[PDB]
A paper describes a structure:
Central to the stringent response are the two unusual nucleotides ppGpp and pppGpp (collectively (p)ppGpp or alarmones). In contrast, short RSH-type alarmone synthetases only contain a synthetase domain and lack the hydrolase domain as well as regulatory domains found within the CTD of long RSH proteins. Members of this ‘small alarmone synthetase’ (SAS) family fall into the [name] (also: SAS1) and [name] (also: SAS2) subclasses and are found in a wide range of bacteria including [name], Staphylococcus aureus, Enterococcus faecalis and Listeria monocytogenes. In summary, [name] always appears as a highly active alarmone synthetase, while [name] can switch between a passive state with low and an active (i.e. pppGpp-stimulated) state with high (p)ppGpp synthetase activity.
Residue numbers in the entry:
A (entry chain D): 15 to 44, 48 to 74, 82 to 209
B (entry chain C): 18 to 44, 48 to 74, 83 to 209
C (entry chain A): 16 to 44, 48 to 74, 82 to 209
D (entry chain B): 16 to 44, 48 to 75, 83 to 209
Write the structure that this text describes.
């Protein structure tokens, strides 16, 4: 419907606001910042419905506004998470530390759903957003697995999924080994 | 002084998305064409503070909203009043009561919360809302006074006042033509 | 089909022209006259309505359009004089609507060029129409379009006459504002 | 004295190269291998410190530097073959540090080019060094430089050896991660 242009637009505003917050977060480290790139994605209404096609057509979907913070090191992930707690204009509703507690896919990230106030002209709206904080190799393994499942439509053999598992054992072992090298300085 | 001016830099970066969003509620036409933010330098602060004793200066962070029509100027003012995350401290409508210079604008100092890591700071910023010709007449006068160092002959100032008297009659006429649509 | 391939070369040329004007202005920072540069690749629908006078042929010049908004009238011709001293573009056509304005009051300085674009395949020579204007010229044009657009070409004489008045003054302004700079 | 003009053309060359890589990726809108492009004009100071092997006061190549960071190893050479089919740049030198890596573990594909820059005065033929890398290559390089900076070129043996171990894996990753795309 066209009640959808108005509400989905509010979610776009929240992302523009988060960009300056994450720009400011690194600008308090300008003495080094771990946030290298940040990719924000508002869901395309239909993907909402196809995911809502599991339920009934509701404002309980968290990844309407999604942001991926890609940090340099694992230690830098939790540093941003702990920093986001000391901010008032957003409260952490949920947090899922898939690092150390990964999925059977090998998938590792640190998701956290927030409640975001958006100052508009009429009044204020409180929208939810799910932030996914990852290292470099974590965002690349995730983007790769998705692009594989996209072409093959969920029908992936065991060896191909097992290969993806090996890449996760390494990418974390990589991010682990690369972390200990920074620790020496 | 390194850290404190940075908070003012964050305040302007935050307003840019606010003005970007205000224009996206008209996507049925938006009046804000360009927006130029200028954080004043350390040296400019002191020389202007040289009239008192060494953060009560408001235009530390300055924003210029250049609107298309005069009517759109007050619409941004009325929009900024229905906002909670900033409160209007002062308002100077140099339109309708302009300076003897011919200078016309609508300045308004606000108090802006800046969410940092430790806590929040409430900083002041001066927003200067203008039409196109107001920003061009202002930018020209400043560049004249800059080259001549405040020593401007009377004839040159009279034309600038004349140039301002006309530019408003322009912005007035161009507004009434839009009204017919 | 092959409309996607040809329209992209026109989009690419603007990306190439965009850096040329960024470089042109970075050679005058000792003051540069270029305040805005807005590139607009023409819309597929607008092309047809303009092509509806011919047959659905690359003789439409403003497929890639750039608006140079300069501070003063004197600043316009300096960009023209700079654009003449470039090899990788040759001026094909020139229409000085300043001093020779239309009856609507429209004033600008258009000049069609031919631009080489080095691509992967080889190089393509496309046409672009550059429109150099002052601040008030770009605003009077943008306003007239928005008026004719809403009223669908049916605009009374009184409304156009006001527009005639509005254009005659803004130039007298741009002239008066020009002469004030001369004294400095 | 007038270092200002000659160093400035290197800034202009990147503005032109930036659109070439922006346009190269727009010819793949059917998949693009170029993820980000970062242009770095060398710092007035670094030129001299780099010149400390010769005599102070244009045979230093990386004055204008561009890093194409690709997703996979196969995507690197696709950019190389695309850059060969362009006329407005000729490859002077090519160093494939992949397959022939350094003893520190550094891996990339460097190639110095010669770029014509159309300016207002005339055209200048400048050199630029493009470094094409995967994701892990740019991160390992950024790590090694940040280490040598803190330790002032004085790095112990284990740290250099660990970095090679860290490098031996990241490429074995980029190799394994490459074949997974091939199965699709």
């Amino acid at each position: 419907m066209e009640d959808w242009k108005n509400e989905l637009l509010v979610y776009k505003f929240a992302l523009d606001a988060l960009d300056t917050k994450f720009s400011i977060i690194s600008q308090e480290y300008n003495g080094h910042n771990p946030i290298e790139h940040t990719k924000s994605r508002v869901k395309s209404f239909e993907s909402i419905v196809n995911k809502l096609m599991r339920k009934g057509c509701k404002e309980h979907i968290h990844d309407i506004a999604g942001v991926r913070i890609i940090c340099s090191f694992i230690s830098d992930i939790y540093n941003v998470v702990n920093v986001l707690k000391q901010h008032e204009d957003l409260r952490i509703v949920k947090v899922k530390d898939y690092i150390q507690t990964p999925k059977p896919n090998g998938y590792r990230s640190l998701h956290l759903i927030i409640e975001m106030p958006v100052n508009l002209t009429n009044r204020v709206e409180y929208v939810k957003a799910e932030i996914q904080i990852r290292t470099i190799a974590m965002d690349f393994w995730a983007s790769l697995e998705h692009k594989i499942y996209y072409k093959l439509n969920n029908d992936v053999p065991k060896q191909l999924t097992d290969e993806l598992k090996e890449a996760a054992e390494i990418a974390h072992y990589l991010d682990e080994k690369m972390l200990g090298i920074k620790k020496e300085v």
